[PDB]
């Protein structure tokens, strides 16, 4: 509309209405110029055997993008508590996005002193990739999302993508994308932008823990009418072979017939937080579970959803089977264990095999008068008819959705880092500053213009999500476990700022507190 | 409308709908001040015999102009592929042009440091020459067109024209044009400009190759009922004259009667890309085919459409009979052969004579008992009744249309560099910055003001063309030749940017892949 009028307002809050909760977040952003308005080809710079798994080919673009795909973007710690203590499940419904109060600044630097002024006629370009025609980078747990704390101003991350590569070289099948070749809306300082999005139907995330285990579903007072083989020999001696059968009952619950079995496993190596218990060797990469694709090895991370550890042992964690978050101010490389937060999937032990254990045993031969029965350990087990399992939990710091790859087939497309898998997830929102050239020469030149005015933009983003709730119906008599704050005195309030104004998140918070019968 | 509102959006894409394809391109431009707001008379500065062919007289203007007349302005490489593999022909239908988001910048340079600021009250003037009253420069294969890659910012070329000249002097018949003497629209930063244009009916470009040759149209199993003269003598000796006649048939297809003959020729000198095969002398200009007009010699370039070379010989090319494009970053003068891309017209061999060959032989005398039959080579042949020919192909880098000169007569007005000839082509679009004078003296002076504020403008151009398609109907059993990318690994993707952000076009791409029966 105009230079002196505001194109939007600040909306941050949650509205709890019945079975719906509506969250709204507003943040202030800053967008630089990336790559000097250039598309640039990029590839791994390394050589040798080590480079092999790390090889890539792709492009970086002048564009930035908006990422709201973490939960702490949309929920305060109190709202997340209010969610996870009272509800058995939740899921996103609608999405509403706004971009407003756009300001374009020009920077003239002379003799080491820089001046910043408004450029009132400059534009910023924005479009959403509604047709999912661009490579989709939002499901890779990247940085650059809206900050959890509403008072922080954040920088918009640069967009880039990878295409097919052989080592660091490309192939004829590799694709190049100009983002200028999409239609986009152009905004001066009075203009604003919005769009709305509709989540496709997904299952409720299961924010509850089971109060029964898959192997304990029987009535503890009654026998089965099934029999099992109790004895193959009468005793010590020669030629003692016999067949004896017993009823499965309360005394022996391990041999009873069951209708359902625990879910699939891919074994992880077990690491202790007590370092003297670990082996004195480097086994981080060498001893890691991995999968290979076209010759390259990828770590299995986090992998299939499995219980992090056995009951009573919390000092162990899967080598690359858990999500690990950094504490506030944690460095990038080779930080100690107290600098990171290792989450655990202990709640899913009821239906899921432990990550660091074998699935079970199988017979490896035929026993005979000349051959003893032999067994072997099942290190990995794929889906069997009759398996039941839980997905990975979601966290306040963790991702919300992922894009399901477009393929002939998939199974249980729920994404492995947690959250909601979608064939049409929330679309990517691309933004860049329109280049403003400096003064051209006075005689014509056919070369493209490499001289521009140094420029950046800033503004406000609001995002609104409607969430559907699934309320707890339980008949449990005794009280539940709840997520709660601790009363003990401390130098800081958790989930607040410190004396320097730095907001931190003390610990990762999962979703599973309330219980359900298995 | 306003300073803080945007006057247009960014539209780039193609829409393939049935028999129509609609392309839309948006670019960012920069317009300087040319000639210090002056019209200036210009003429060749050279003297001597060499100057004769190069003599000219004309004017340069303060105005710039917009040129979208190359195909890579409107088509991406993938769209051009999608066009040429699937279609027998195409042609333009409608045109829509927009000019928006205008910014005028003033440059104040003090002590070697220059400041750039917005001048919000300045205007830019624009008009289209709808009545074709200006000299038309768009059909001369000039530089300054919108860049093929949408992310590049381009400088607008300066407008100028030539009028009648005798050497470097003018004549009374020479015309002068003030472009200020047209009505034009004036635009401040909130204003925008548009117009729409309707292509006049042109034939479809023939984007196909013939799967038959003009001389092979007979049924290979059957004789003709026509006779030809097989023998004029019985054998060796004296007085052996006779007349013998044979049937033309499968055994001798060269002597058969035919209804149609190949098209016209003007012979070109043949040059090899293997330099040891070429003569050790300078023959580029001296050995070139030319035409003379009013005493001046013009190279025949590219000339009539003729097959570039005989089958099996691709190392030869016509001396000035082909279009030659430069590779990205190629210098202006005396570049090597690997720096340029020589296109070929090998597809049209079926109906057209080879450029470097004679058309044929004619009888030069009357044979008699005292005189042997004599023949001579036809170096150039004009139109004959019964000729058929193909036009020159169009390229992704090549021109789209030309203006047919306004004359009493023309023949097959299709332009010789390729594309669509039109009596009313897309009009010229002229643009200049309105001069803003600096402070005048405080006492009156009648001289025109020579002191101005240094100023330039920038903005966005979008152009939209609707193209009509002619779909391939063929009954051919075996598969076609298609244009395709090569799978082999390379350091760069073709038709992409490199690591420095430079977009290049690897090779020229013609239109002729699908085949038709002759």
């Amino acid at each position, epitope marked *: 509309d105009g230079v002196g009028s505001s194109s939007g307002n600040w909306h941050c809050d949650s509205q709890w209405l019945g079975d719906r909760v509506i969250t709204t977040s507003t943040r202030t952003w800053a967008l630089p110029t990336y790559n000097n308005h250039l598309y640039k080809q990029i*590839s791994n*710079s*390394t*050589s*040798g*055997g*080590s480079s*092999n798994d790390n090889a890539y080919f792709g492009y970086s673009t002048p564009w930035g993008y908006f990422d709201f795909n973490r939960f702490h973007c949309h929920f305060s710690p109190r709202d997340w508590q209010r969610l996870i203590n009272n509800n058995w499940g939740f899921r996103p419904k609608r999405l509403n996005f706004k971009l407003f109060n756009i300001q374009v600044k020009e920077v003239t630097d002379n003799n080491g002193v820089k001046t910043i002024a408004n450029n009132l006629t400059s534009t910023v370009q924005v479009f959403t990739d509604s047709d999912y025609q661009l490579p989709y980078v939002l499901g890779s747990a990247h940085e650059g999302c809206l900050p959890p704390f509403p008072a922080d101003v954040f920088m918009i991350p640069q967009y880039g993508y990878l295409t097919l590569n052989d*080592g*660091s*070289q490309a192939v004829g099948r590799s694709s190049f994308y100009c983002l200028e070749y999409f239609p986009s809306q152009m905004l001066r300082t009075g203009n604003n932008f919005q769009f709305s999005y509709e989540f496709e139907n997904v299952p409720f995330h299961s924010s509850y823990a089971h109060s029964q285990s898959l192997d304990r579903l029987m009535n503890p007072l009654i026998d089965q009418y099934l029999y099992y083989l109790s004895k193959t020999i009468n005793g010590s001696g020669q030629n003692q072979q016999t067949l004896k059968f017993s009823v499965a009952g309360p005394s022996n619950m391990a041999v009873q017939g069951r209708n359902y079995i625990p879910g699939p496993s891919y074994r992880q190596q077990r690491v202790s937080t007590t370092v003297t218990q670990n082996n004195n060797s*480097e086994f981080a*990469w*060498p001893g890691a579970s991995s999968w290979a694709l076209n*010759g390259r090895n990828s770590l299995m991370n986090p992998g299939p959803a499995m219980a992090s550890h056995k009951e009573g042992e919390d000092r162990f964690f899967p080598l690359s089977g858990s999500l690990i978050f950094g504490k506030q101010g944690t460095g990038r490389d080779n930080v100690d264990a107290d600098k990171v937060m290792i989450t655990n999937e202990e709640e899913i032990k009821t239906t899921n095999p432990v990550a660091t254990e074998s699935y079970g045993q199988v017979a490896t031969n035929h026993q005979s008068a000349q051959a003893q029965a032999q067994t072997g350990w099942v290190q990995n087990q794929g889906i069997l008819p009759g398996m039941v399992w839980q997905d990975r939990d979601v966290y306040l710091q963790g991702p919300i959705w992922a894009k399901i790859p477009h393929t002939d087939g998939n199974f249980h497309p729920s994404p492995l880092m947690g959250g909601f898998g979608m064939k049409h997830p929330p679309p990517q929102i691309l933004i860049k500053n329109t280049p403003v050239p400096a003064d051209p020469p006075t005689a014509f030149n056919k070369d493209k213009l490499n001289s521009f005015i140094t420029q950046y933009s800033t503004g406000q983003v609001s995002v609104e999500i409607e969430w559907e709730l699934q309320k707890e119906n339980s008949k449990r008599w005794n009280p539940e476990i709840q997520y709660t704050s601790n009363y003990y005195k401390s130098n800081n309030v958790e989930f607040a700022v410190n004396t320097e104004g730095v907001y931190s998140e003390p610990r990762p918070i999962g979703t599973r507190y309330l219980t359900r019968n298995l | 409308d306003g300073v803080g509102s945007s006057s247009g959006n960014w539209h780039c894409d193609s829409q393939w709908l049935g028999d129509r394809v609609i392309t839309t391109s948006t670019r960012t431009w920069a317009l300087p001040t040319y000639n210090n707001h002056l019209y200036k008379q210009i003429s060749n500065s050279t003297s001597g015999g060499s100057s004769n062919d190069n003599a000219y007289f004309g004017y340069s203007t303060p105005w710039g102009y917009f040129d979208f007349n190359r195909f890579h302005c409107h088509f991406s490489p993938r769209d051009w592929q999608r066009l040429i593999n699937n279609n027998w022909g195409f042609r333009p239908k409608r045109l829509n042009f927009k000019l928006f988001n205008i910014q005028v910048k003033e440059v104040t340079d003090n002590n070697g440091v220059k400041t750039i600021a917005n001048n919000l009250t300045s205007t830019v003037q624009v008009f289209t020459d709808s009545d074709y009253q200006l000299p038309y420069v768009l059909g001369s294969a000039h530089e300054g067109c919108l860049p093929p890659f949408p992310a590049d910012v381009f400088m607008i070329p300066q407008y100028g024209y030539l009028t009648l000249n005798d050497g470097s002097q003018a004549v009374g018949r020479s015309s002068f044009y003030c472009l200020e003497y047209f009505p034009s629209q004036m635009l401040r930063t909130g204003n925008n400009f548009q117009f729409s244009y309707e292509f006049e009916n042109v034939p479809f470009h023939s984007s196909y190759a013939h799967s038959q040759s003009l001389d092979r149209l007979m049924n290979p199993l059957i004789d003709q009922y026509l006779y030809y003269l097989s023998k004029t003598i019985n054998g060796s000796g004296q007085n052996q004259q006779t007349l013998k006649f044979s049937v033309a048939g499968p055994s001798n297809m060269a002597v058969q009667g035919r209804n149609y003959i190949p098209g016209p020729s003007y012979r070109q000198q043949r040059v090899s890309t293997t330099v040891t095969q070429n003569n050790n002398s300078e023959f580029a200009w001296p050995g070139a085919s030319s035409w003379a007009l009013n005493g001046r010699n013009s190279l025949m370039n590219p000339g009539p459409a003729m097959a570039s070379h005989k089958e099996g010989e691709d190392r030869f090319f016509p001396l000035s009979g082909s279009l030659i494009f430069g590779k990205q970053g190629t210098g202006r003068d005396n570049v090597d052969a690997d720096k340029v891309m020589i296109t070929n017209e090998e597809e049209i061999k079926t109906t057209n004579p080879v450029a470097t060959e004679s058309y044929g032989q004619v009888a030069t005398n009357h044979q008699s008992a005292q005189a042997q039959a004599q023949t001579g080579w036809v170096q150039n042949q004009g139109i004959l009744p019964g000729m058929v020919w193909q036009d020159r192909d169009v390229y992704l880098q090549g021109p789209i249309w030309a203006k047919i000169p306004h004359t009493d007569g023309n023949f097959h007005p299709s332009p010789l560099m390729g594309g669509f000839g039109m009596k009313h082509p897309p009009p010229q679009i002229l643009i200049k910055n309105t001069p803003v004078p600096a402070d005048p003296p405080t006492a009156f002076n009648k001289d025109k003001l020579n002191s101005f504020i240094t100023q330039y403008s920038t903005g966005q151009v979008s152009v939209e063309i609707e193209w009509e398609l002619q779909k391939e109907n063929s009954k051919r059993w075996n598969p076609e030749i298609q244009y395709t990318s090569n799978y082999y*690994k*390379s*350091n*760069n993707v073709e038709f992409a940017v490199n*690591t420095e952000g430079v977009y290049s076009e690897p090779r020229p791409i013609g239109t002729r892949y699908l085949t038709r029966n002759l």
Partner: antibody
Amino acid sequence: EVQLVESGGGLVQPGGSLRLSCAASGFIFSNYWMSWVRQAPGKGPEWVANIKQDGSANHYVDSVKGRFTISRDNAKNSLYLQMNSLRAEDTAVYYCAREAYQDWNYDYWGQGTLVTVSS
Amino acid sequence: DIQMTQSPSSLSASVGDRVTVTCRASEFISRYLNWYQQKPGKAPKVLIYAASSLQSGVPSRFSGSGSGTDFTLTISSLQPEDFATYYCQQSYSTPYTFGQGTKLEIK
């Protein structure tokens, strides 16, 4: 089939600068990483530098960092090693090698040129 | 960087004998280990690359085994042509490093 030729070897006083050129006729030169390997007299060979198949990146051994520049011309299929501030230790036979695709070993080696740094 | 240690530094055997050379790596270099045979006045020639795999055109008597930090070069049915200096090189990371070398002697 695949041939690598090294030229420019010779004797130079310390602090001197020398340039070495490698010619490759047998393969697609732009698909491969190329290395420089030196073997001092009576010693095992030693890796000096490698450069990317397009020349975007390059690596050098610590001892020679800043004094040597590896360079690649893909159109001429030639590899160049630029040596500055030469030392007595530097004198060795210089080998031009091609790094194998995927495996990364030196599948092909040039004959090599002896380069002497003498007082 | 990574250090490569080759043992024994020198070895002497006779035609028909079985010879084994051991290479050790300071850090994990996976399967990227090569064995080069070198004769005076010539460049090193690759015998075995990527741990186990044998170079084409090389006799089947040369064999290689091992992964991670320990590798071994095995020669069965030794031949007069086999006497040379042998190097183990790691191509896992830069700077690429070579072993000290094992020299074989006629007996």
